[PDB]
Structure formats: structure tokens, C-alpha cells
Amino acid sequence: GKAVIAIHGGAGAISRAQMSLQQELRYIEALSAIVETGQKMLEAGESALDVVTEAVRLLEECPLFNAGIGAVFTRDETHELDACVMDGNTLKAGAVAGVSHLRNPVLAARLVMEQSPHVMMIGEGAENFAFARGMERVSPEIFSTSLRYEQLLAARKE
Amino acid sequence: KAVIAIHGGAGAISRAQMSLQQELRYIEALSAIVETGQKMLEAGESALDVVTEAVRLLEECPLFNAGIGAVFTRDETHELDACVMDGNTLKAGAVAGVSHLRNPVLAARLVMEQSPHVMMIGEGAENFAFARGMERVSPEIFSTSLRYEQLLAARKE
Amino acid sequence: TVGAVALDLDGNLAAATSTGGWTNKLPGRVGDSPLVGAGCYANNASVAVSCTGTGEVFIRALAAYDIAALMDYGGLSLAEACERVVMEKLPALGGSGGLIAIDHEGNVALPFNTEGMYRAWGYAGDTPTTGIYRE
Amino acid sequence: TVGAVALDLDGNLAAATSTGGWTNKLPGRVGDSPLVGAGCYANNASVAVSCTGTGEVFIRALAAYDIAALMDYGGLSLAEACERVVMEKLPALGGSGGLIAIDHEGNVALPFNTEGMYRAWGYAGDTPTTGIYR
Ligand SMILES: [Ca+2]
Ligand SMILES: [Ca+2]
Ligand SMILES: [Cl-]
Ligand SMILES: [Cl-]
Ligand SMILES: [Cl-]
Ligand SMILES: [Cl-]
Ligand code: NA
Ligand code: NA
């Protein structure tokens, strides 16, 4: 049927009582901008694969959402990022897990799909593969936000 | 009707490239391990204990590409992976990319039984297993001449 | 966890998922997000799915593939498959979360069993819909 | 790759898979073996499965869960599900290999599309069978 996109930024315990309207409008504005980018790409005849890759890259870039920039912290105050992409036309897929030095995990997952025979790469091996395909190494601190660091300190106190 | 099946890998196994003595060693190993499982099932042991022990024995057996006798990576290392699943609870445990655990299937079962999680990878999986009392091994314990010669042949082709 | 699903003008489906995991996570823990058929699946014959939730239950129940299999083999509608997985099967295993799905006919679903799910959707050329809370 | 599936006297199913991967593997590559529903699956309502083969195609086709789903939702027999996955679907995706499966009724299948698969099976209280070639 008609071309269409859906996105998510995570499911969980989200309550009006705990939230403010200022916070809510920031999330609504971010979701609206990203879904509209995808709608316009679909309208222009861009592939479903390019559309979901771009939407997830933008959700990664946006510090409001727990992916890429704005990732939560592990017990060890590190970031460990994971991603997957799948093409329903070829049934090809690419995935990375346990990556700390790649800005956009979904782009690393797409590199595994398109520039290797493989489906899933982890850790150092995934990063070395990505660097060989021309992706740049980043400092793991680029993902770190005060909001997520305060959530770690509170989880430890709890 | 209680029953076990095991495998030691599918691939290009050809009579032309095998010796009879090699075939006999595989048949003896497969027969010994499937019989161990049959006797456990007969005694009323759980399916989970039976598949864990059969895989532990296939790991220990250097003829099979799991545990002792693992193939070598490009880098002359071993990276081992395993999974176990309990059909009664639908609980599962898995490890990927481990090099310092003797029996990956026991590390997978450790994730299932001694954590809330399903899957652990790499050094984090190893550190979790060590914290739970599993022994750290030297990475060369899995290494065999047969598998090293297969890596050299792959490099020639 | 974040994700996207799409159906393009050529009738192709795709899915993608990305995450940082959980605050205070055990280093080396892997959830459903990078696992094909757990947190991400697409097949032109059925559906594109991206999941978000507690992780372990979406792996044990192969949530993303289970939507596809219920539709393809079971003959369930996207709505029926989403109800079965998210509102019945995942809670039965102690799972919470949700997913987004688009089928090969352009039906869209954003089921969740949680208090909220940050989400949006839109048909090409139309105004989008956003959500945080339940409707 | 190695594996085991079993049905016990209490009617419980279980599966396990373990591997060293592939000779000359790119470090950090993950195949089907440690992935629930790809290389290993068990559910008392359907089947226990352990897979072995070329890796990527078993992930893309969720081979172990697909056996369960074809039986549970499709109404296929264990034999029909094994034929569909191993002899039709995996080769169509460029894959080769096999699997072992036991259903909740105690049917056992060891399908493979390769020259060989090191394998054995046996019922509690009966003689075992081994195999290498077709
Ligand atoms: Ca026991
Ligand atoms: Ca007999
Ligand atoms: Cl760095
Ligand atoms: Cl001889
Ligand atoms: Cl509201
Ligand atoms: Cl034979
Ligand atoms: Na982000
Ligand atoms: Na071995």
C-alpha cells in the first residue's frame, strides 16, 4: 500500500506526574522532526533501507534518546552500544554489539550488511572492521550526558 | 518417549579425503557421547542436564570444533560461542566471543542460572563467569596441530 | 533503545534498532536490539518490526520474528499478531515494552504494555502523529 | 560447531549448541550458534533444535525458531518443517548445513543439505545410531 514510516525512542515507565510539559514538548518536537524527515524521503522515492537508517541515525544523534549520543552508562561508567538493520527485500541484515568507539552504531551495522559477507560483529573486531571500511574512531566520552550520568548515580544510591 | 540427538558439525565431509581410522575415531566419539546421554535420560535426568553434559563432552573431545579442538581465527586466536535453552521455562543463556573459558556451554548455562540475563559477550562475559567462580584458562588450551594445519592450508588457497 | 520501520513506494520493508542498553548494565550484557528476529526483523512477505523493552523476554520469545510468523504461518492480521505478542505472550514471561510494525499492505501498529512509548508515524505526503502516553 | 537436543521422561525439551566458529574467521564475527532462535531453540510446546552450518543464513532465516513456528502456527510435521527449512529455505538464501530436532512427541530428525554431518541419536532404553555421510 501507501509508503509509511514509524519510529520509537523507547518504551517504559513514563508518567505525566513525573514529567513536565517543557520536557514533553522537547520529545514531541524531536519525534516530529525525525518522522517528517523520513516521510519526505519516502515521498521522494528513497528506499525503506535508507529511510530507517537515516531515522535511527537522527535518533542516535539526538541526546534525548538512549542510542548513540545520550546513551545510558554501564555499571563501569562506560558506554556499550548495539544496533541492527534488516532489508526485507534481500533478507540481508547487519548488526554490531558492544561498540564504544563508533559514533553511529546503525551505520556500522549497515557496513557489516553491505561491505562484508557477515550479519553480526562485536567489540574490537567490529570496530577494526569499521575503521578498515573508513569509519572514524571517536572518544567514548562523546556519548556522555549529565542527565544519564545523574541517572547512574541515582541507580547506585538505590 | 525420551530421546537424545547430537551433532559434531555439517559440511564437506568426503570419503575421498577421509581415512577409515579417522571415520572410526568419529564413530567411537559420537557413540560414547550419545550413549552417555541415553543412560542419563533412562535414569530420569533432565533434558537440560543431558544436553549440557553432551555438549560439554563434545567440547572436551578434540575431534570437534567446540572447546578443545576449536578452529583458529585469522589472528591465530580462538573465539568460542555457545547457547543453551530450557523448553520448560523458555529461559536461555548464551556467550559469544570468549577465549578464556574452558567450556562455553557451562558459561552459557551460568548466564541462564546465575544472572537475570540471556546473552553475554567478550571480556564482560568472562569477567562475569570468573566472579561466579568459573576458572580462567590460558587461551592456548584449545589449540591443536590439526586445526593449525587447516589454518595454514586456508592461507595457501 | 530507538528504532524505525518503513514501507517504500517500491513495496520494500526495512527495520533498524539502536541502543545504549540499561543504566548500570553489567558490562557485556546484550539485549534484543542487535539480534535479528528479537529486536529487529524485516521481510517483504510479512512485516518490518523494531522492538523496545526489558530485552531478555524479547529474545526468549523472538518477538520481532514471532509477529512475522504469526502473520505468515498463522494468518493473523498485524493487529492480532501485535495483541498476541505484546499484550499476552510478553507479559506471560514477565516482559514489558513495545514495538513498531508495518506490514506489506501498509498497515502500521505501535503496541506497548508500558505506561509510555516515545513514538511517531506518518504516511508519505500526510501529517505525522506523535505519542508518549497511552490513547 | 556441536550440539545436542533431548526430550526427558518428564516431557521437557532442551537444546544446546557450542562452536569455535570457522577457520580463518574475521575476529569479532558471530554466527548462529549463540543466538536464540538461530542456532539453538527449545520450547516444550513444539521442538528442541541445534543447528550447524555456514552461520549467516541460519541467522537471516531464524532457522531454529522457524522449525518451531512452522509446526506450532503452520501445522507442519517435524519432517515437513525440517524439509522446508534445510532443503528449501536455507539453500535459497545461499546457505548450507543441517540441524538436529526433537518434537514434544519424541519424533527426531537430523536433516542436512551438505556431503556430511557428524551425528548420532538414540531413544532411552534402545541402541544408538551414528552417521557421518548421507
Ligand atoms: Ca542438575
Ligand atoms: Ca530397537
Ligand atoms: Cl578513543
Ligand atoms: Cl584402516
Ligand atoms: Cl496524557
Ligand atoms: Cl555414515
Ligand atoms: Na541519542
Ligand atoms: Na572439542
Author numbering:
A (entry chain AAA): 2 to 159
B (entry chain CCC): 3 to 159
C (entry chain BBB): 179 to 313
D (entry chain DDD): 179 to 312
The authors write:
The Escherichia coli enzyme EcAIII catalyzes the hydrolysis of L‐Asn to L‐Asp and ammonia. Using a nature‐inspired mutagenesis approach, we designed and produced five new EcAIII variants (M200I, M200L, M200K, M200T, M200W). The modified proteins were characterized by spectroscopic and crystallographic methods. All new variants were enzymatically active, confirming that the applied mutagenesis procedure has been successful.
The determined crystal structures revealed new conformational states of the EcAIII molecule carrying the M200W mutation and allowed a high‐resolution observation of an acyl‐enzyme intermediate with the M200L mutant.
